[PDB]
Amino acid sequence: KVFGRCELAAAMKRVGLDNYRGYSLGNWVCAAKFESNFNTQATNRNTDGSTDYGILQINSRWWCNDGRTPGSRNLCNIPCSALLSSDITASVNCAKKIVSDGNGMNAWVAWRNRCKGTDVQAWIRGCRL
């Protein structure tokens, strides 16, 4: 599923992401935009052989098990395919573990390079949340 901007904002808020660990909703919507373009089915392979999954492009090396990443840790206890669902709950739950990880949202390279320090409030502008 390809979410609309405000639709995703509302789904994320409902599942408790707004200000989770100090990160406003605009941060999460911005990250989804640049990581997957709001598409739950997005997958991208990495150079080390691991693969990024879903709306938040969660990496198979540490977070999920895709059965093809030798030595993956699967810290979120889920098959990576679960992250491609039209229901963002699993992705959000795993993201909550990642952001609590100590590095914050810097774990997401697109957030660091394209969202960090920008007026992320523009991302939820006009939405009825």
From Swiss-Prot:
Keyword Heme tagged: no
Localization, UniProt: Secreted
UniProt cross-references to Gene3D superfamilies, sorted A to Z: 1.10.530.10
Tissue: In the egg white and polymorphonuclear leukocytes.
CDD domains, A to Z: LYZ_C
Record's keyword annotation contains Aminoacyl-tRNA synthetase: no
Protein role: Lysozymes have primarily a bacteriolytic function; those in tissues and body fluids are associated with the monocyte-macrophage system and enhance the activity of immunoagents. Has bacteriolytic activity against M.luteus.
Listed name of the protein: Lysozyme C
